[PDB]
A paper describes a structure:
In this work, we characterized the MerR-like drug-binding protein AlbA that displays a high binding affinity to albicidin. The structural homology to TipAS suggests that AlbAS is a member of the MerR-type transcriptional regulator family. The crystal structure of the drug-binding domain AlbAS revealed a tandem architecture with the NTD and CTD representing structural repeats of each other that are connected by the extended helix α6 of the NTD.
An asymmetric unit contains two copies of the protein that are virtually identical with a root mean square deviation (rmsd) of 0.6 Å for all Cα atoms. As postulated from our bioinformatic analysis, the structure of AlbAS is organized in two repeat units, i.e., the N-terminal domain (NTD, residues M1-R112) and the C-terminal domain (CTD, residues Y113-E221). In contrast to TipAS, which binds its macrocyclic ligands in an N-terminal pocket, the elongated and rather rigid albicidin molecule is accommodated in a central tunnel of AlbAS thereby pervading both, its NTD and CTD. The binding tunnel is decorated by residues of all helices, except for the N-terminal helix α1, and exhibits a predominantly hydrophobic inner surface. The building blocks A, B, and C of albicidin are surrounded by the NTD of AlbAS, whereas building blocks D, E, and F are enclosed by the CTD. Besides strong hydrophobic interactions, a salt bridge between the carboxylate moiety of albicidin and R181 of the CTD might play an important role for the orientation and fixation of the ligand in the tunnel. Importantly, the side chain of N75 of AlbAS forms two hydrogen bonds with the amide proton and the carbonyl oxygen of the central l-Cya-3 (Φ and Ψ values of 66.0° and −128.7°), thereby stabilizing this specific conformer of albicidin.
Author numbering: 0 to 214
Write the structure that this text describes.
């Protein structure tokens, strides 16, 4: 069976997808069907119904990957190389592209209340520049936070430096603009959806960042 080709026996017991729960399958049946309908209509990704659908997708996908970023990246490996993936899930790379942009717009809608028009335009473009590098970083942050790596060590500062590079990629290099983004996240729970980040890993990261920013 399909997940057994990609997950160890121990991983399979903590992977919700591997349950073939009937209710979970029906939920994804509806999520896929709704995405198919919006795509076939060429629905713009910033329409409310698209943003709402993408928000549901990310909520469900985080739950069904057990909140483990490494399980998310395993699914991405399957979308690239598992022949049965479309047949078994109904999810396609084109569909994922639509959800990705609608989920981006779900965050741009919130950032619009904190940024001016020129900052919003910059981020609407550059949000996508390095977006797909975040799951690898999140996995490396989970491992670091797990092993109580010193946030101030060279290995911790390399992680903070990788965060800054991905953050400045979407936010820009302006200090006042960056502070708007950091304030918005503190104020808006939706901005940390679709991240696989936990309060524990965020604390570890924000300690590493704080060391980087004061120095
Ligand atoms: C806000 O910024 C910050 C931060 N920020 C962050 O830490 C931060 C962290 C991470 C992130 N991002 C991510 O991790 C991230 C980025 C990209 C992705 N993408 C993917 O994985 C890609 C594409 C995209 N996209 N694949 C998918 O989506 C994907 C979609 C669906 C499936 N589905 C299936 O296989 C199914 C359903 C099977 C099935 C089965 C059975 C069935 O019956 C039917 C179906 C599989 C994969 C996902 C997550 C982020 O966002 C950029 C952040 O901002 C931190 C601190 C501060 C501060 O201020 O201190 C701050 O400001």
């Amino acid at each position: 069976h399909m997940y057994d080709r990609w997950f160890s026996q121990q991983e399979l017991q903590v992977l919700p997808f591997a349950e073939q729960d009937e209710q979970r399958n029906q939920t994804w049946l509806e999520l896929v069907g709704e995405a198919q309908q919006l795509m076939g209509e060429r629905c713009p990704a910033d329409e409310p119904r698209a943003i709402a659908l993408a928000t549901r997708w990310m909520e469900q996908l985080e739950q069904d990957t057990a909140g483990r970023p490494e399980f998310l990246t395993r699914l991405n490996e399957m979308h690239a190389a598992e022949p049965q993936m479309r047949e078994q899930t109904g999810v396609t790379p084109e569909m994922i592209d639509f959800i990705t942009r609608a989920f981006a717009e779900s965050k741009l809608a919130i950032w619009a209340r904190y940024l001016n028009a020129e900052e919003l335009a910059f981020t609407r473009q550059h949000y996508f520049d390095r977006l797909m590098e975040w799951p690898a970083l999140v996995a490396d942050l989970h491992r670091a936070c797990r092993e109580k790596r010193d946030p101030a060590s060279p290995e911790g500062q390399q992680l903070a430096q990788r965060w800054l590079a991905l953050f400045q990629s979407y936010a820009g290099k302006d200090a006042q603009t960056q502070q708007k983004f950091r304030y918005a996240m503190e104020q808006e729970p939706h901005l940390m959806k679709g991240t696989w980040m936990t309060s524990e890993v965020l604390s570890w990261l924000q300690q590493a960042i704080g060391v980087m920013m004061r120095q």
